[PDB]
Design a protein around this ligand. Structure first.
Ligand SMILES: Nc1nc2c(ncn2[C@@H]2O[C@H](COP(=O)(O)OP(=O)(O)O)[C@@H](O)[C@H]2O)c(=O)[nH]1
Lengths: 164, 53, 261, 430
């Protein structure tokens, strides 16, 4: 994920040279931060600072769709994950959890979380995953129903002094 | 086109306990048992605003 | 309407169609995770679509209880001509307004109901479908009863229903109704091997008690729609995550430090 | 007030209802023209329970007759008191079931049942305040055992709060007139235990035995059997229709008689029944009534109640009697038979009084008893069921129109579990 766009790299054991190919977009200069890959590896879904999730097939450099319609997340795509069914869970910079089915990009359920999202970790069987904010807050987010629950909260940064 | 795989999508909140075949509403004639709600035909909206082709 | 627009349409209004289909239901087998209300409904329809095809592969014909009836015609003569017709029910017929009441199967006056009109008419018991989906008999019946209420949608102007669920591709216009059958499926019917299925005396009448239903069901086409997960893995993960989350409340307590390593 | 409606299906149900309505009309003094010819006001004080009023002063029973063949109702309409029934209430099929439970529960019956369920819903909506629904049917016939129980399920799942009871005629293997009793009997019981708030079982073998041994009349007939079962039926709701020292409707009986949801199968008795030669000799007293009531042979079921322990008993007395002697007799019977009454439910006998006796009699007694002796019926039914099922006999008739062996296996397992849970409470001790 180059700041300009998506690149696909080819490494071959025969020669040390690396082959670089660029994914092209028609009159699109959105900047890309995060990326995730289909388990089938046919497509890769990449975030954007604007708030929409683009999806590009690996085989062709063309992009198939824009992303969420009529709605943007207002601070970019912090974290991105995929369920086995293909539903994509996306975290916004302002603090927001939403899931998109592989259909028209419309959210099945939406919820908000305190602080900027920084980590999403799916558990085995892909249920009830863990979330980590930018404000040092640990949250636990259920699947198919986005209800934020705080397990433990941590200090933000630079404790200066303690009193009793 | 694309469509999510419908067998793999999963519901987490609902629990997996199964009521089984054995049950019994006979002898349970309390006044607070729920009653079936019949289907109702929707409001007919007709076509006063559809396109005329 | 593409058999899915119906799904969102019926899911949109719960007050109009209240039932167990509106929400997810626990399965009978704990090894399987639950589905969504919409997803389980599609799975039920796929199971029914396969159930009807494997029943129609035999001389027995299946009907929906309020939505048409799947039949076939025998003109008669190592061999009969078989042609499917799919007559509609009377309630579905009333909703149609411009549909001409042409007869596609002919029966005498004593032959009045579809059960004796058809050669091998079937109840379409939802028990095998519920077993295959590992779902409840009551909820699958509720799903059928909710979906057969397509006449309400049809009565509204327009709203052509293009419902497929497999071999039969049936289309509903404003008030006109037509259908098509899979060409390969039709050719299987004319593959002229049905002389054995038509007669009930082909079996030596010995294996009825020798062969067990588990063995017969294993070789049946049904139950192969969904993959079988690893039974050990599923509850390993289940109780594992359950313990993890039930006592993941506190991260501060250590009681075992490992300073150097 | 607190009225109930009647629904009968199948040949057996039609025959039972025909005599029951004759009995109730005779007791109320209603002529076969629907014209009032009683002598007391009490015959009109609570007439709304069973009869609806029409213009011209005539009455119509609120009974719904259903069948898959027209012969039974065509024959019964020509009988005495046959004009009372409203002709619209007759719903009939043109095919028949042929003693097949699958035919009588799946294919033709479900497409027939829309009209009968609709007329039932009009009947229920019209009356002021429902009390419940009563059904009479036999489990040995396919069409009756199918439509009866399916309508039970439908009406129960539509009016979950109203009381619901059925007089079920169970097939005894001694007198079996068909070869397919166990199959449809077990299938019907499988969902009957699920939905029936109250079920009361009647045996043709026991009817024959009581007719031969007690009445000692030469030629028993189905008319006499209908008369006996109709008297038993009327004894249950007599107190609901007439005053008394302690009235007890079906709801009170159900509350007092079932300790647990899944034990709602009952056996009933009627007294007095005196032989031909001895009507002039026997003396009608409370002790005589109680001793005949608790006699095993007076039972209308082949189950011997001394093979098990009574969970509970309930008695409805009709006539003018002081409650002290009745209570004394019940207490004496309970004390003298401690072996046959399970101990963790002391004083398990309910008594109720209605001061209006049956016409021509000064006193009468109706009995309903919940005891563990009924288990042997289910045990023998399961025995014959598995005996005919292990060879898959006659299974093609059922499986050709919607049946799989999974349903039969589930019904067998459920009834076996019913027997087991019915039998642990017999051995339970405090
Ligand atoms: N009490 C009584 N029992 C009957 C009568 N007719 C038939 N039965 C019993 O019912 C059983 C057969 O029931 P069936 O006629 O097949 O029921 P159906 O199929 O619903 O008409 C026999 O074993 C008889 O003992 C009747 O008029 N009165």
């Amino acid at each position: 994920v180059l700041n300009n766009g998506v690149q696909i790299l080819t490494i071959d054991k025969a020669n040390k040279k690396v082959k670089s190919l660029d994914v092209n977009f028609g009159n699109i200069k959105r900047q890309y931060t995060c990326v995730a890959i289909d388990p089938s590896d046919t497509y890769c879904y990449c975030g954007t600072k604007t708030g929409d999730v683009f999806e590009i097939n690996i085989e062709r450099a063309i992009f198939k769709r824009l992303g969420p319609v009529k709605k943007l997340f207002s601070l970019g795509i912090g974290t991105l994950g995929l369920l086995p069914n293909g539903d994509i869970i996306v975290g916004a910079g302002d603090g927001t959890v939403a899931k998109l089915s592989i259909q028209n990009m419309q959210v099945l359920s939406q919820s908000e979380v305190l602080g900027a999202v920084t980590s999403i970790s799916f558990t085995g069987d892909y249920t009830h995953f863990f979330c980590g904010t930018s404000q040092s807050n640990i949250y636990w987010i259920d699947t198919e129903k986005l209800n934020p629950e705080l397990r433990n909260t941590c200090h933000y940064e630079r404790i200066n002094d303690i009193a009793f | 086109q694309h469509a999510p795989v419908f067998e793999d999508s999963q519901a987490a909140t609902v629990v997996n306990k199964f009521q089984g075949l054995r049950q019994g509403t006979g002898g349970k004639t309390s006044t607070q048992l729920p009653v079936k709600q019949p289907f109702q035909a929707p409001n007919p909206i007709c076509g006063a605003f559809k396109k005329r082709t | 309407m593409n058999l899915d627009s119906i799904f969102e349409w019926i899911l949109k209004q719960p007050i109009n169609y209240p039932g167990k289909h509106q929400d997810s239901q626990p399965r009978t087998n704990p090894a399987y995770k639950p589905l969504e209300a919409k997803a389980q409904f599609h799975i039920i329809f796929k199971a029914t679509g396969e159930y009807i095809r494997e029943k129609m592969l035999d001389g027995k014909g299946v009907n929906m209880r309020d939505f048409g009836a799947f039949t076939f015609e025998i003109f008669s003569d190592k061999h009969h001509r078989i042609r499917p017709c799919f007559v509609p029910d009377k309630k579905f017929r009333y909703s149609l307004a411009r549909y001409a009441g042409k007869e596609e199967i002919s029966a005498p006056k004593s032959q009045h109901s579809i059960y004796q009109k058809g050669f091998g008419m079937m109840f379409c018991n939802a028990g095998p479908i519920a077993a295959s989906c590992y779902l409840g008999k009551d909820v699958v019946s509720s799903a059928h009863n909710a979906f057969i209420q397509a006449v309400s949608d049809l009565t509204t102007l327009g709203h052509g229903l293009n419902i497929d669920f497999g071999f039969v591709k049936v289309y509903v216009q404003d008030r006109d109704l037509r259908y098509s059958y899979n060409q390969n499926f039709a050719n299987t019917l004319n593959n002229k091997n049905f002389e054995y299925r038509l007669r009930k005396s082909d079996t030596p009448t010995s294996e009825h008690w020798n062969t067990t239903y588990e063995s017969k069901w294993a070789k049946s086409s049904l139950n192969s729609l969904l993959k079988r997960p690893n039974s050990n893995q599923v509850r390993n993960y289940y109780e594992k995550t359950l313990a993890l989350k039930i006592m993941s409340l506190d991260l501060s307590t250590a009681e075992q430090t490992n300073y150097s390593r | 007030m607190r009225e109930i409606v009647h629904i009968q299906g199948g040949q057996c149900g039609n025959q039972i209802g025909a005599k029951f309505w004759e009995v109730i009309s005779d007791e109320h003094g209603i002529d076969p023209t629907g014209t009032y010819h009683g002598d007391s006001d009490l015959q009109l004080e609570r007439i709304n329970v069973y009869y609806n009023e029409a213009t011209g002063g005539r009455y119509v029973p609120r009974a719904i007759l259903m069948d898959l063949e027209p012969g039974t109702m065509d024959s019964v309409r020509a009988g005495p008191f046959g004009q009372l029934f409203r002709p619209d209430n007759f719903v009939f099929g043109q095919t028949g079931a042929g003693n097949n439970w699958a035919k009588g529960h799946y294919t033709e019956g479900a497409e027939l049942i829309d009209s009968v369920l609709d007329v039932v819903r009009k009947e229920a909506e019209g009356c002021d305040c429902l009390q419940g629904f009563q059904i009479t049917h036999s489990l040995g016939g396919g069409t009756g055992s199918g439509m009866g129980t399916l309508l039970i399920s439908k009406v129960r799942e539509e009016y979950p709060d109203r009381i619901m009871e059925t007089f079920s005629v169970v097939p005894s293997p001694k007198v079996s007139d068909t070869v397919v009793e166990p199959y449809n009997a077990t299938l019907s019981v499988h969902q009957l235990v699920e939905n029936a708030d109250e079920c009361m079982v009647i045996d043709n073998e026991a009817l024959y035995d009581i007719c031969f041994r007690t009445l000692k009349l030469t030629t028993p007939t189905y008319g006499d059997l209908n008369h006996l079962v109709s008297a038993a039926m009327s004894g249950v709701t007599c107190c609901l229709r007439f005053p008394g020292q302690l009235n007890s409707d079906l709801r009170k009986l159900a509350v007092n008689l079932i300790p647990f949801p899944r034990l709602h199968f009952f056996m009933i008795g009627f007294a007095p029944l005196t032989s031909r030669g001895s009507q002039q000799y026997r003396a009608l007293t409370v002790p005589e009534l109680t001793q005949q009531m608790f006699d095993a042979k007076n039972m209308m079921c082949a189950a011997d109640p001394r093979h098990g322990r009574y969970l509970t008993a309930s008695a409805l007395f009709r006539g003018r009697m002081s409650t002290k002697e009745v209570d004394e007799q019940m207490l004496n019977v309970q004390n003298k038979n401690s072996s046959y009454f399970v101990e963790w439910i002391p004083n398990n006998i309910k008594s109720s009084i209605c001061d209006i006796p049956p016409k021509g009699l000064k006193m009468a007694v109706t009995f309903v008893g919940n005891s563990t002796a009924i288990q042997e019926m289910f045990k023998r039914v399961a025995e014959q069921f598995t005996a005919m099922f292990r060879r898959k006999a006659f299974l093609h008739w059922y499986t050709g129109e919607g049946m799989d062996e999974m349903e039969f296996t589930e019904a067998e397992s459920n009834m076996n579990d019913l027997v087991s849970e019915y039998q642990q409470y017999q051995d339970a001790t405090a």
